[PDB]
Design an enzyme around this catalytic site. Sequence first.
Site, mmCIF file in Angstrom:
data_model
loop_
_atom_site.group_PDB
_atom_site.id
_atom_site.type_symbol
_atom_site.label_atom_id
_atom_site.label_comp_id
_atom_site.label_asym_id
_atom_site.label_seq_id
_atom_site.Cartn_x
_atom_site.Cartn_y
_atom_site.Cartn_z
ATOM 1 C CG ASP A 159 16.436 -4.804 -14.259
ATOM 2 O OD1 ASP A 159 17.012 -4.677 -15.361
ATOM 3 O OD2 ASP A 159 15.247 -4.474 -14.071
ATOM 4 C CG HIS A 185 11.784 -4.400 -15.983
ATOM 5 N ND1 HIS A 185 13.148 -4.566 -15.876
ATOM 6 C CD2 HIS A 185 11.339 -5.428 -16.743
ATOM 7 C CE1 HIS A 185 13.512 -5.646 -16.543
ATOM 8 N NE2 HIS A 185 12.433 -6.187 -17.079
#
Lengths: 323, 319, 323, 323, 289
Positions: A159, A185
Site C-alpha cells: 500500500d 490490508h
Amino acid sequence: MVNVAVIGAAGGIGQSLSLLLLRELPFGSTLSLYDVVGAPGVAADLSHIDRAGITVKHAAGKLPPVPRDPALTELAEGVDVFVIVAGVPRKPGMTRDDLFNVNAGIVMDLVLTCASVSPNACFCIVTNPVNSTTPIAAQTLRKIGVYNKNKLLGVSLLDGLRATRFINNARHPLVVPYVPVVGGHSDVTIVPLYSQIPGPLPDESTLKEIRKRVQVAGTEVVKAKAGRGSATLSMAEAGARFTMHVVKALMGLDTPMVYAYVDTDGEHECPFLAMPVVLGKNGIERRLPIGPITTVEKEMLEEAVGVVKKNIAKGETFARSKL
Amino acid sequence: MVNVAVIGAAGGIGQSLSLLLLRELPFGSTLSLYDVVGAPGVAADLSHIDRAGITVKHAAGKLPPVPRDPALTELAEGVDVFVIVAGVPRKPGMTRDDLFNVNAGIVMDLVLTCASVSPNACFCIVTNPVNSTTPIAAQTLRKIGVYNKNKLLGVSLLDGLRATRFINNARHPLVVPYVPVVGGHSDVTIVPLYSQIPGPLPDESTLKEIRKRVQVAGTEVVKAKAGRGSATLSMAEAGARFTMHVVKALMGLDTPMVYAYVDTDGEHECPFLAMPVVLGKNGIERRLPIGPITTVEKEMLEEAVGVVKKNIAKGETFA
Amino acid sequence: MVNVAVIGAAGGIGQSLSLLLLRELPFGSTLSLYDVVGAPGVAADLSHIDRAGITVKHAAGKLPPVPRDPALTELAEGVDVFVIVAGVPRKPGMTRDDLFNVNAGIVMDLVLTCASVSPNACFCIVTNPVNSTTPIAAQTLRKIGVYNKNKLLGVSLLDGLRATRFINNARHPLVVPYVPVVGGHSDVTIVPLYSQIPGPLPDESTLKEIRKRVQVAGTEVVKAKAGRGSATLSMAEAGARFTMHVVKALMGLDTPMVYAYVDTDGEHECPFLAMPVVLGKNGIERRLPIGPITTVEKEMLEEAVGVVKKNIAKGETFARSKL
Amino acid sequence: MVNVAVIGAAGGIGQSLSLLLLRELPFGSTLSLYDVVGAPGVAADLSHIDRAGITVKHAAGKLPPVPRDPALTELAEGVDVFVIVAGVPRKPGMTRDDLFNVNAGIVMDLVLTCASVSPNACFCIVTNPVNSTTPIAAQTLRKIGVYNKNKLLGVSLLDGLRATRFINNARHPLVVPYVPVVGGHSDVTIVPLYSQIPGPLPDESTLKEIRKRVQVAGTEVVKAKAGRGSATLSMAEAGARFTMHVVKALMGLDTPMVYAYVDTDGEHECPFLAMPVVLGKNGIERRLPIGPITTVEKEMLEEAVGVVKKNIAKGETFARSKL
Amino acid sequence: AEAQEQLQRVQNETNYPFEPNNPYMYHDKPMEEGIAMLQLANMAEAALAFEAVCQKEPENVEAWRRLGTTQAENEKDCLAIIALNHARMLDPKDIAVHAALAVSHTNEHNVGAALQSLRSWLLSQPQPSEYRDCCTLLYAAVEMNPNDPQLHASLGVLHNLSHRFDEAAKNFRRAVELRPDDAHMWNKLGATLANGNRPQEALEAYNRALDINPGYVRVMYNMAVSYSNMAQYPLAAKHITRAIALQAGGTNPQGEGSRIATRGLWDLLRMTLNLMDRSDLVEASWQQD
C-alpha cells in the site's frame, strides 16, 4: 550468516521473489526453497547465476498435501527468517466463498510444521487476506506456545508503494520517498495519511479522488487481465524489500522504520493494526503512536477500525474450533 | 533520454526481464512493452511501482498473428534499443530444427517493421537458436538497405556466467569476476578459455570435466524440470545485465568490454563468431584479437568454427 | 564489531585518511584517533557529520614526547586494525641520510605500546621507509613473543594505482581494473608486470618509458611542489582503500585478493616480498606464486631481490642494537 | 559533458573538496583547479590516482596577485559550475568584521574574472560570511550585465548536518535522514524547525538545550583547536554533497530538494533567506513556502529576519576608504 | 597650430591626455601661477596650472614633482600614477617620484610594484607573501634615525598592505608629533583607522585637516564613507555631493576631461540613495548636473 527460507517457490510470486532475493542478499548467506510441486525446476535454475558466496538448498514434497511433510522438518533447521507465500490460485476461488476456508488451513499447517523444530524465527505473512491470516498464525503459535509478539510481521508495504507513486505523478517536480499508511490490508481498511508529508498539498476535491484510488487498486489489475490472474509483479517486489529490511535489521547493519501489520499489546484498542514500528536485533523494539491527523482521516480510521474488529473476529472464530 | 523497448514481454522470460529492467534504468527513461496477448496486464502491474522518473508505454496486438501489425509500428517511433525475446517454449516432442522451423519466421517479421521506422537503433537478439537467427536478422536488414555492422549484437553472456560460477565453485576461496568463452551459443560450439585467468588451476581431468559441464547445462536444467519449461530466470538475468551495458554505452557513462556474437568484418574465417569487443557511443568501436591459447583449445576452436560455419550456412538461406 | 584506531592521524595524510574512513565504515563501527598534538581538533571536526552508528573516541599525548604514553594505553582496548601513519614531515633542509633512525624509533615505541595490551589485532604499516621498517615491526612483535605471521601488512597499493593510471592512458579506450606489481615500494625495486593482463600490449620501446615513469614517479611530485611538499593525498586514498578491504574481509563479508608487503614463510628465498595473497576472517589464508613472466622481468626481479635483501639486512641490524 | 571549476584549491577546504570530488564525479567529467600558489603541486598529485574518464587541468598565477589574471581568464573557458572557496585562515584577533573586510574584495575580483568570459554557469560560494558575501556577487553580476536569479546559490548545508547529528543522538533507536533549517548562517540567524520531523519529540527543556548548541557548535570547534584553527574537514564534506547535487540536477539525473541561501524573488519580504528549493535542468525552478510552524519557533524567526536584513544592508553598503 | 603640435607631441610615452579646454598655457609664466594658486586653497585648478606649465617643458624635472602630489590629493588616482611613472623614467633618483608612487600605488591594491617602488625610494638613503627582503631592508627600528619623518612616520603603507589594522594605528599615532603639520599626512592616519572599523575616533583627524587645509576633497570622501559605514545616510549624502561639487571649481563647464577619473565618486552617491527608499535619481541623474 543468516538463512532465509521461502515457503512456496513455483508460483507466480515465488519465482520473482527468489530471483530478487538472490542478487541482494549479503555475502556468505544461505537461501532455502520449498514447494509441493516444481521445487527442483526453480532450484536448478538459480544454481547457474554468477553470485559468489550464496548457496541454495531445496526440498520437494509428496503430490498429496499430507500434513507435517518430513521434507519441511529436514529443511527447516537453523532457519532464521521464514517467508510464508503459498496460496491457492484465485482463478477457481470465486469471490471469498471457499478461498478463505482453503487458504486458512494451508498457512496454519505450514506454520505449525515450521515452528515446531525452530521456535526462534521471524514470520512474514504474505498470503491472501492478511487481516485474518495473522491472528490464525498467532493462535497456531500460542497453542503449543513459543509465541513472541516481537516477531510476527504482516507484509503491508504494498500500500505504501501504491500511495507513493500516485502523489509523485500529480506533483511532478517534487518527489517524496514514502507516505505513511494506517489501518489494515483490505478494500476499505486503508487510510493513507497525506497530511504528514513535506510540501504543499492539492485541494480536497482531487485529494479525495487520489485517496479513493488507493483503496480500489487490486481490482483494476484483475479487470485489466480479464480474470487471468492478478498483480504478481508488484507483491514480489514489496515482499523482497520487506524481507531485505528484516534481514538487515537482524544482522545489525540497519535500524529502519517500517509500517507493518503488528500486534498492539497495550497501545491501541484493536489487537492487531498497521502502525509504524522500529526494528532491531530482536524483532520489534518499540512501537510508535499514529500521530496528529485531520478530521476526515479520523472518521476514515474509525470506519477502518469498525471493519477490522470483525475481520479479526471472523478469523478467530474460524480458529479455536479444530481443538 | 534513452528508450528501451522489449518485444514480447508477456511470456515466462519477458515478465522476469522487464521487472529487472525497471529497477536500474537511469532517471528519465521510458520502457515500452509489446506482445500479442497479456501486454495490458503487465503494463498495469508494473505501473504501480514506487520508482520515480520512469514512464511505461504499452501496445496491444491482435489474437490472430497478422504480419506487420499496425499497432507495433506505432509504438516503435522513438526507440533507441531493441531487444527481441519473442519465440516459443521448449516443450517436449520436437527436435531443434522443428523449433527453428517456426522461430526463423517470427524473428524476420519483428525485425522488418521495427527497422522500417527506426533505422538507427541497436539490436539485442536473444531468441535462441542464436547461432542462426543473427545471420537471418542481418539478411533481413540488408534487404531494406540500412545495415550497420556496428549495431548487431547476439546475447551470449549466459555461458560466461555458467563458466565463471563453475570455476569459482572449484577454486574456493579464490574468486574471479569473469572468464572468456568464445565459439558460439550452442552445445559443442561453446569453447571456454580457462588459461587466461589469474591464479593456479587444477589438473587436466578436472578442467576437462568442467569444460564438459559448461556446454551441457541446458540439458540438465530441462531434465531437472521434468520435461516442461526451460531456463527461464537465468536467461532473463544475463539478458538484462548485458542490455544495461549497452544503455550506458549509448550515454557516454561507460566503455564496457563484452563478449558477444558479432560480425567479424574481415577477421578469422567465419563471418560471425563470439569474440571480445569494445563498445562505445556509436555501437561497436574496436574489435580485439582472441589472444594466446593452449594447444587443446586450438583443436576445440577448429571444431567449433567448423560447426558454426555449418550452422550459419544452414541459416543463411531458409528458402 | 570493528574499532579501527588510526595512530598519528592529525597532520597531512592522517586527516584525509580519517575523513575517508569515517564516511564509508559499516554501521555500528567505532573510529578512534590519537596523536601528539591536534587530536582534539580532528575529533571535534569529525563529530559533526551526520552518520548513524559511528562513535568517535579520541585521546591526546604529552606535547614533548614520552615513551609508553599512559594515555595511548587507555585507547587500545578492543582495537583490531591498528594503523600507523606516524610519519615525520621533514623538509629539504636535510636529506635522506637521517629520518630513518627516528621513524624506526617511533615505530618501535608505537607498535610495542599498542601490542602490549591488544595482542589479537592487525598491523598495517604506512610509515615511509617500508622495506626497512616492516622488519622493524616484525622484530618488535617477536620480542614480546606474540608474533603472528598472518597479521602484518605493509601497504603497497600506490604502485598499482600509478601503474593502472599510466597504462589506461596509452591504450584508450580499452580499460583494465588493476595491474599486478611486485618487488617493493621504493627506487628501482618496483617491478610492474604488464605482460599478464588482457589486451594488445603496445610496443616495447614505449613500454620501457612507461615502466621507467612508474619507477621514478616518486621524485616528480616533490619536484613539482618547489621541493617543499610531497604526495600526501594519493597515499591517504590508497591506505583508506587497503584498510577498507581488510576491514570488510575481517567481518566475513568478502575474501578478496590483494598485493602487499608480507612475510613469505618459506615460499621464496627472500624473507619479505610483495606477493599476491587472498585474505579471510583470520588474516591471510592462501599465498599464490608469481606466475609466468617474460624474459626481462627475470632480470628486473633479480635486481629487486638483490636490493630488498640489503634493505632487510639493514633493518634487522638496526633493531638488535636498539636495546 | 560536465566541467567543474574548484577556484580556490591548494589550501584548506579546497584540497579536501577536490579529493572528495575526484571520486563522486560522473564518468567523462573534467576537473579544473586554480590557486595563486600550489596549483601545479596538487594537480601533479591528484593525477596519479586511477579512475578513467576524469581529466585534471590546472593553471598557476603570479605570486603577487594582480586584477584580471591572464591564467584564470583562460582557464575559465567552458565551465559549467564554479565553486568559490578562497578566504583567510582564522587568526585569533580578527573579530567578526575584519574577515569580511578582507574577503569582500577577493570575492568581487574572483567573480568578475570568472564571469567575464562564461556567463551561463552556477556559483557555489562557500567562502565563510555567507550572509554578506552573496549580495556582493549579486551586485557584481548586476553591474556586469549578466545575472540570473536561478543560477546563484550559497551553501549552508552544514547547519542541516549539525542539526541532524544532534537530534539523532538523544533519540537513539530512531534515525531521521534530514532536518529543515531556516534563516542564515551565523550565531543567531539559524533556526532548526523541529516541528516538521516525523516521530515523537523529547519534550521541552532539552529541545532548547539542543537548539542553542546547534548555533554554538562553531565556536566550540574553534575553541577546541586552541584558537588557531577552524572547521575545515566537516565544512569540506558539506560542500562536496551540494556540488554533487547541483551537477546531478544539471545533467538531468535527479531533481533534488535542498535548503540553500538564495534570493527570494517575491514571497518573503527579506531579499535573501535560506528556504527550501527544488533544483533542475536550469538551476532553481520552483521555490517553496516555509510551511506551518509552532509558537516557540515564531519568536526566533522574527529576530533572525531583522539580523539578516541588517547583514544584507552592511554587505551591500561596502565601500573602501582611500588612504 | 603650435599648441596642437604640442598636444600630439605630448600624446606619447608622456600621453597624459587632459582634454585641452584650459586657457592657462595661454597665460605666461604658468609655474608661478601654479605655486601661487594653491598657496591658500583649491589645489584642483592649481593642479590645472601645474598641467599648464608642465605641458610645454618635458625636461622640467620639478614640474611633474608637485603635479603628481596635487593630482593625488584631488581624488583622481589613475592618470596621476602614469604621469608620475613618466616622471620617474626621466630622472629615476628622487624620493618624490618614489614615495608618492608607492602609497598611491596601493589605492589600486597592486601589491606587486608597490614593494619595488618602496625599494627604489629607500635606495638613496645616504646613511604571508614575498615581503621578507623588502621589510628587512626597510626596518630601521630606532637604529640610527629615531623619529625620522620620511621613515618613522611613513612605512604604515606596508602595514596597510598586510591588512593588519592594529600595528598601523599606533605606528601612525606615535608618528605625528614630529612634522606635526601636513593635511595629506593626516589622511595617512585618517583612513587607516577607518578601515579597521573604529569610525568615531577616526573622525576628529578629518576635521583636523580642515584646521589647516579646508580645501581637501579626499577628506570629505573618507568622512562620507565613514558615515555610510555608520548608516547615517542623509548628511553623508549631503556632504559627499558637496565633495563632488567642490571637486570641480571655476572652469567646470569646460573643466571636464575623459570623465572616467571621477567615476567612483559618481558611484558613491549610489549604493546609498537606495537605502532611504527615495531613489528617483538612479540612472536618470546621469548628466552630472
